[PDB]
Amino acid sequence: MREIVHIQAGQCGNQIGAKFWEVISDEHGIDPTGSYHGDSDLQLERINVYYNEAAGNKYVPRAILVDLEPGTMDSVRSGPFGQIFRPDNFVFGQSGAGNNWAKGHYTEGAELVDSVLDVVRKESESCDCLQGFQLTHSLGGGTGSGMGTLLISKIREEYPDRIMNTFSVVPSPKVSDTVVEPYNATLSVHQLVENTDETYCIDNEALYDICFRTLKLTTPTYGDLNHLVSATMSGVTTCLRFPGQLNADLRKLAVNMVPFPRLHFFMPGFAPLTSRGSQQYRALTVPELTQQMFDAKNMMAACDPRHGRYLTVAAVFRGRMSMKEVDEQMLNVQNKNSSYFVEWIPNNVKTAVCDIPPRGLKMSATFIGNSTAIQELFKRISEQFTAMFRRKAFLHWYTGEGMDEMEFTEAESNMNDLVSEYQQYQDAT
Amino acid sequence: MREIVHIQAGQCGNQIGAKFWEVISDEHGIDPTGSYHGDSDLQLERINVYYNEAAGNKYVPRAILVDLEPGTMDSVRSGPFGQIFRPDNFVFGQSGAGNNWAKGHYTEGAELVDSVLDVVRKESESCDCLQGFQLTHSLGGGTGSGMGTLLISKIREEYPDRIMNTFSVVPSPKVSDTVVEPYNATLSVHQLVENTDETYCIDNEALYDICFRTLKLTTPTYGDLNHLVSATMSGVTTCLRFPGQLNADLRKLAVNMVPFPRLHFFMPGFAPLTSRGSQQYRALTVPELTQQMFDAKNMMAACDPRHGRYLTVAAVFRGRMSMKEVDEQMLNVQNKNSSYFVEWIPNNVKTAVCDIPPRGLKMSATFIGNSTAIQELFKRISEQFTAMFRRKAFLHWYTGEGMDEMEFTEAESNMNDLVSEYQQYQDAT
Amino acid sequence: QALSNEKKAKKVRFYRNGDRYFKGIVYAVSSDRFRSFDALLADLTRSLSDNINLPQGVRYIYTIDGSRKIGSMDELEEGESYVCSSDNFFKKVEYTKNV
Ligand SMILES: Nc1nc2c(ncn2[C@@H]2O[C@H](COP(=O)(O)OP(=O)(O)O)[C@@H](O)[C@H]2O)c(=O)[nH]1
Ligand SMILES: Nc1nc2c(ncn2[C@@H]2O[C@H](COP(=O)(O)OP(=O)(O)O)[C@@H](O)[C@H]2O)c(=O)[nH]1
């Protein structure tokens, strides 16, 4: 039970998942064919959450893959672990987004979403008891920002109770991979604050520091950058797929980590992260895994938490460990950083402990942090939006798709309402 | 418990420690890999004071290595016992000090000290109960005089109770290895008399006499000169790492040897020191080890104690010996040299006896002497300072780094206050 | 003569723009270390931006008030702070609080 349907969109959201389903098949011991070659029966105990048993004792991923051009879907089926998917799920148009939000939301979105929602409705009826939907896209492009936020507005109208979380990739502040990405991010957050339950904001710029400063990688390709994102996504649902001493799921995070129905943007965090040779100059204890989850140089969103305050903190531990050792450290880091946490929430750390470690390691952890420090991230998108909108530049590529300036004004006014909320609860008393 | 964090700075302070950690690994029986190959369980009993047990039963030194150019840190990691360190601790800039105190204290010191104090704060939290910090630098250079005294002024503001001792190398009086070393020494002692608890002054010129007159070495390289300094540094803390009949530590020396909060500059001393062939024409008794610790030709600071008076005397003995034999000789050398000790301090000899000798020997000792004879050392630095300052030569290399002449005047006035204090207590009654 | 013209460095503070939690590194600003005003901005580039500030680098130097753009280095005064921005728009937060 408690099955999860995984939806992918955009060029970024497909290449994350193409590495992600390789990770999940490693934990359950699945060949690229689709058979089973594991060793323990715990791998097949909760296999139904990401898999459907086909005829012949073969398992397929419960995945839906969406694009507007076949240039990326051909890359997925060509690589390894491409034969494992079902050929019906590859839904793709022919026009291409053209790195345009309005084309992803009005023109090519309306000509594709009916073919998508039939596949969504087919996968929903196959599940015994649906847990909820997870989505992998990005905010910079036109596909994952336009077609992705269109699907959330359609799913929530058909499923007003299931959980809905997105692993969106927020654009980095220093370098810019798209000229019009302040327009795409502003018109997407206006859709994410209305129809999502929680959201995992990831910056690219934080991943380049972790691969360089921490892991000491000389040539980090996207095969290594997406591998860190995939380890974080598996670590959120690792208690739902395995027995543990203290269990949580996707529902228990949305109750704990979300104190208000708007403030649901997170920042992830993973530990441990050694080097190729510096792994032996280090002991693997719980206070060693604790101190790495809270420094600013291990965050995956480009914002220092010292500028703001935490509100809620999740910490999903994997591998066998003493519960006294975990609970004392979670108390210890709260007393010494008494100015960095919010005052009117006592015991603001939620802890979940699984039993099975990741493949190759002995123990690991996963940090899920809510904070007021992400208001600087929404200042910069709102600042770069109004810097471009006051000259009305790059606007006729959106007006010609049937959109008025009133659409931009209320979308920008929604974000400044969000900035005032994180400012208000930072100085509460 | 009672862990010690070892900090190194400068070209001199790194090459001392690079021999020093070879000595400590010999006493505890540690390979250059980092494993353990000892014979007795006493080596692992107090191993935590200079080591942290990593995963895989490997031990790393609790060391922090600081420089401004990578020319010396590359030499440390290339030699033997270079693989034992942790690669995170090698903190180094790129500009280089340029043999300049103001560059080590203002320009390149401020651009490095924040990266250093994060590593200091990480090593402090790893310790169970911190004993204190020891530092190895020199006064002649620009790195160990500028960056080193900057760290002491930052550590004392964060740790106003832990002990703080430095093994600084005072420049020799006859030869001069730096043209501007009266400027570097004067601006460093002004920082050492305010924020250190005790200080072990070592002259290079005294080490050349001991290697020639006593040990009869024809070609003494720095691999042999630093080996005598490293034997003295281990002999101070040998009672903290091993059980003994009468135990002392770094705290008990600062209570005994320091009668006034300024007069805390020492002179070391080691015994026995044989030759390569003359070792057999000598008996190893406690009165034989006694008479070698008090003559002027075994001091490691270029000052004859006969010009002044002792105030306090420590004597850390190693190896098994009769306590009656030790206490009678410490009484005997006080009665016959009744003019060479101070009058208003009775029983001015502190004795500590360990149990385990150094490697290869049967018994040894360590002399730690406080005296009024080091006022001649501070006359010469103050005389050579005012000889250069009255013409204002070599001054624009310091003024251009943002420094006024008022900084030099109060620093020189501080040293003449120190000269009057040793002059006053020499003729007390 | 030999006792020269006291080639001294000004001890001035540089707050960076936007970052409220920053103290301002005091530089040794003199005419000997920078022959022109343009050479000072190259030193401001590396020693202010580390991870999260200033995508455009350093372009404009303001007063702490700030109501005047700094021109040449002769317009600097000893012992007063300056906001180092990179755009025309000035952010008005309390920089000098809790030095
Ligand atoms: N982390 C990560 N980001 C990616 C990857 N591929 C693309 N991106 C990001 O995705 C964004 C571009 O959006 P894109 O996926 O092409 O959307 P589309 O062009 O509308 O289909 C930029 O911010 C890229 O940095 C990837 O493999 N990993
Ligand atoms: N005893 C001893 N002194 C050394 C050694 N290496 C350098 N020195 C002394 O260190 C001083 C020069 O300072 P240095 O360490 O180079 O500082 P820096 O140049 O600012 O990095 C001189 O007094 C040298 O005699 C060494 O291996 N042993």
Q: Where are the domains of chain C?
A: 1-99
**Residue A246, token pair as written in the block:** 């203290």
Smallest CA–CA distance from A297 into chain C, residue? C51
Q: Note the maximum CA span of chain B.
A: 63
Residues A103 and A252 in one domain: yes
Which residues of A make up each annotated binding site for Mg(2+)?
A: 69
C79 CA to centre of own chain: 11
Nearest CA to ligand 1 atom 6: A12
Q: What 8-state DSSP symbol labels residue A362? A: S
Q: Which residues pair with B67 in a beta bridge?
A: B92
Q: Do B401 and C26 touch (CB under 8 A)?
A: no
C61 CA to centre of own chain: 6
Smallest CA–CA distance from B398 into chain C, residue? C8
Residue A360: Cβ within 10 Å count: 7
Q: Do A302 and C52 touch (CB under 8 A)?
A: yes
Residues A180 and A304 in one domain: no
CB A204 less than 6 A from any atom of ligand 1? yes
CB A171 less than 6 A from any atom of ligand 1? yes
Residues B369 and B392 in one domain: no
Q: Which among C70, C90, C94, C91 is positioned nearest to C82, based on CA atoms?
A: C70
Proximal ligand: closest to the CA of A300 = 1
Residues A177 and A308 in one domain: no
Q: What 8-state DSSP symbol labels residue B210? A: I
B223 CA distance to ligand 2 middle (Å): 13
Q: Which amino acid is at C94?
A: E
Q: Do B400 and C6 touch (CB under 8 A)?
A: no
Q: Which among A129, A81, A89 is positioned nearest to A6, based on CA atoms?
A: A89
Residue C85: Cβ within 10 Å count: 22
- Alpha-carbon distance of C95 to C99, in angstroms, equals 8
Q: Which among B368, B370, B289, B14 is positioned nearest to B169, based on CA atoms?
A: B14
Q: Which among A23, A15, A16, A17 is positioned nearest to A5, based on CA atoms?
A: A17
A303 CA to centre of own chain: 17
Residues A340 and A350 in one domain: yes
- Alpha-carbon distance of A414 to A193, in angstroms, equals 9
Q: Classify A317 as helix, strand or coil.
A: strand
**Residue A168, token pair as written in the block:** 């969106």
Q: Are strands A63-67 and A90-92 parallel, antiparallel or unpaired?
A: parallel
Number of domains in chain A: 3
Q: Do C7 and B392 touch (CB under 8 A)?
A: no
Residues 6+ apart with CB under 8 A from B6: B17, B50, B61, B62, B63, B64, B133, B134, B135, B136
Method by which the coordinates were obtained: cryo-EM
- Alpha-carbon distance of B41 to A297, in angstroms, equals 40
DSSP A24-81: HHHHTTB-SSS-B--SSTTTTTTGGGTEEEETTTEEEE-EEEEESSTTTHHHHHHSTT
**Residue B198, token pair as written in the block:** 């005790």
Determine contact, residues A366/A235, Cβ cutoff 8 Å: yes
Smallest CA–CA distance from A307 into chain C, residue? C21
- Alpha-carbon distance of A30 to A26, in angstroms, equals 6
Determine contact, residues A320/A355, Cβ cutoff 8 Å: yes
Residues A80, A81, A86, A92: is their CA dihedral positive or negative? Answer: negative
- Alpha-carbon distance of A55 to A86, in angstroms, equals 13
Q: Is C6 on the interface with B (CB under 8 A)?
A: yes
Which residues of B make up each annotated binding site for Mg(2+)?
A: 69
Best C1, C8, C25 residue to mutate vs chain B (most B CBs within 10 Å): C8
Residues B296 and B351 in one domain: yes
Q: Do B399 and C3 touch (CB under 8 A)?
A: no
Residues 6+ apart with CB under 8 A from A259: A311, A312, A345
Q: Is C33 on the interface with B (CB under 8 A)?
A: yes
Q: Which atom of ligand 2 is nearest to the CA of B11?
A: 15
State the CATH number of the domain containing residue B102: 3.40.50.1440
Tokens 């000792």 belong to residue: B365
Q: Is A306 on the interface with C (CB under 8 A)?
A: yes
Residues B246 and B324 in one domain: no
- Alpha-carbon distance of B264 to B378, in angstroms, equals 13
Interface partners of C (3+ CB pairs, < 8 Å)? Answer: A, B
**Residue A58, token pair as written in the block:** 């073969």
Q: Classify B25 as helix, strand or coil.
A: helix
Q: Do C55 and A304 touch (CB under 8 A)?
A: no
Q: Which amino acid is at C67?
A: S
Spell out a b/e string for A122-142, using b for 16 or more CB atoms within 10 Å of the CB, else e. ebbeebeebbbbbbbbbbbbb
Helix (H) or strand (E) holding B370: strand B365-371
Q: Classify A401 as helix, strand or coil.
A: coil
Residue C21: Cβ within 10 Å count: 8
- Alpha-carbon distance of A66 to B393, in angstroms, equals 76
- Alpha-carbon distance of A29 to A23, in angstroms, equals 10
End of a domain among B373, B391, B417?
B373
Q: Is B401 on the interface with C (CB under 8 A)?
A: yes
Determine contact, residues A263/A374, Cβ cutoff 8 Å: no
B62 CA to centre of own chain: 17
State the CATH number of the domain containing residue A416: 1.10.287.600
Q: Is C88 on the interface with A (CB under 8 A)?
A: no
- Alpha-carbon distance of B8 to B92, in angstroms, equals 12
Residues A414 and A352 in one domain: no
Q: Which among B70, B81, B1 is positioned nearest to B34, based on CA atoms?
A: B81
Q: Which among A113, A191, A114 is positioned nearest to A149, based on CA atoms?
A: A191
Residue A276: Cβ within 10 Å count: 8
Q: Which amino acid is at B252?
A: K
**Residue A106, token pair as written in the block:** 């009005």
Determine contact, residues A278/A216, Cβ cutoff 8 Å: yes
Cis peptide before B272 (omega within 30 of 0): yes
As a whole number of Å, the end-to-end CA separation of chain A is: 43
B44 CA distance to ligand 2 middle (Å): 34
Cis peptide before A272 (omega within 30 of 0): yes
Determine contact, residues A306/A340, Cβ cutoff 8 Å: yes
Q: What 8-state DSSP symbol labels residue A87? A: T
Determine contact, residues A102/A150, Cβ cutoff 8 Å: no
Residues 6+ apart with CB under 8 A from A400: none
**Residue A257: half-sphere exposure toward Cβ, Cα within 13 Å:** 31
- Alpha-carbon distance of B320 to B317, in angstroms, equals 9
- Alpha-carbon distance of B221 to A393, in angstroms, equals 72
A80 CA distance to ligand 1 middle (Å): 20
**Residue B212, token pair as written in the block:** 């020639």
Determine contact, residues B275/B207, Cβ cutoff 8 Å: no
For chain A, count helices (H), then strands (E). Answer: 15, 14
A120 CA to centre of own chain: 20
Phi, psi of B378 (to 5 degrees): -85, -15
CB B308 less than 6 A from any atom of ligand 2? no
**Structural domain range at position B168:** 1-259
- Alpha-carbon distance of B369 to B375, in angstroms, equals 14
> C-alpha distances in angstroms, A96 versus A104, A285, A292, B289?
9, 49, 42, 90
**Residue C90, token pair as written in the block:** 């000035």
Residue B1: Cβ within 10 Å count: 10
A222 CA distance to ligand 1 middle (Å): 10
Q: How far is C16 from chain A (nearest CA, A)?
A: 15
Q: Which residues pair with B368 in a beta bridge?
A: B268, B314
Smallest CA–CA distance from A292 into chain B, residue? B122
Interface partners of B (3+ CB pairs, < 8 Å)? Answer: A, C
Q: Which among A418, A149, A168 is positioned nearest to A300, based on CA atoms?
A: A168
Residues A299 and A220 in one domain: no
Spell out a b/e string for A81-118, using b for 16 or more CB atoms within 10 Å of the CB, else e. beebbbeebbbbbeebbebbbbbbbbbbbeebbeebbe
Nearest CA to ligand 1 atom 4: A12
DSSP B232-284: HHHHHSTTTSS--SB---HHHHHHHS-SSSS--EEEEEEE----SSTTSSS--
Residues B138 and B16 in one domain: yes
CB A222 less than 6 A from any atom of ligand 1? yes
As a three-state string, the secondary structure of C7-53 is: CCCEEEEEEECCCCCCCCCCEEECCCCCCCCHHHHHHHHHCCCCCCC
Resolution (A): 3.9
A14 CA distance to ligand 1 middle (Å): 9
Q: What 8-state DSSP symbol labels residue A171? A: P
Residues B287 and B255 in one domain: no
Burial class (CB in 10 A: 0-12, 13-18, 19+), A46: middle
Determine contact, residues B22/B7, Cβ cutoff 8 Å: no
- Alpha-carbon distance of A26 to B228, in angstroms, equals 57
Q: Is C23 on the interface with A (CB under 8 A)?
A: no
CB B375 less than 6 A from any atom of ligand 2? no
Residue A215: Cβ within 10 Å count: 16
B137 CA distance to ligand 2 middle (Å): 8
End of a domain among A259, A290, A316?
A259
Q: Quote the Cα angle for A425-A408-A165, to 5°.
A: 55
Determine contact, residues B153/B111, Cβ cutoff 8 Å: no
Q: What 8-state DSSP symbol labels residue C69? A: B
Residues A306 and A406 in one domain: no
**Residue B315, token pair as written in the block:** 């004597």
Phi, psi of B420 (to 5 degrees): -70, -25
Determine contact, residues C10/C74, Cβ cutoff 8 Å: no
Residues 6+ apart with CB under 8 A from A419: A375, A378, A379, A382
- Alpha-carbon distance of B231 to A33, in angstroms, equals 65
As a whole number of Å, the end-to-end CA separation of chain C is: 41
Q: Are strands C10-16 and C27-29 parallel, antiparallel or unpaired?
A: antiparallel
Q: Do B60 and A281 touch (CB under 8 A)?
A: yes
At the topology level, CATH places domain C1-99 in Ubiquitin-like (UB roll) (3.10.20)
B253 CA to centre of own chain: 14
- Alpha-carbon distance of B97 to B93, in angstroms, equals 10
Q: Classify A400 as helix, strand or coil.
A: coil
**Helices marked H in B294-348:** 323-336
Determine contact, residues A143/A112, Cβ cutoff 8 Å: no
Tokens 């040299």 belong to residue: B337
CB A141 less than 6 A from any atom of ligand 1? yes
Tokens 């020799």 belong to residue: B172
End of a domain among A241, A259, A277?
A259
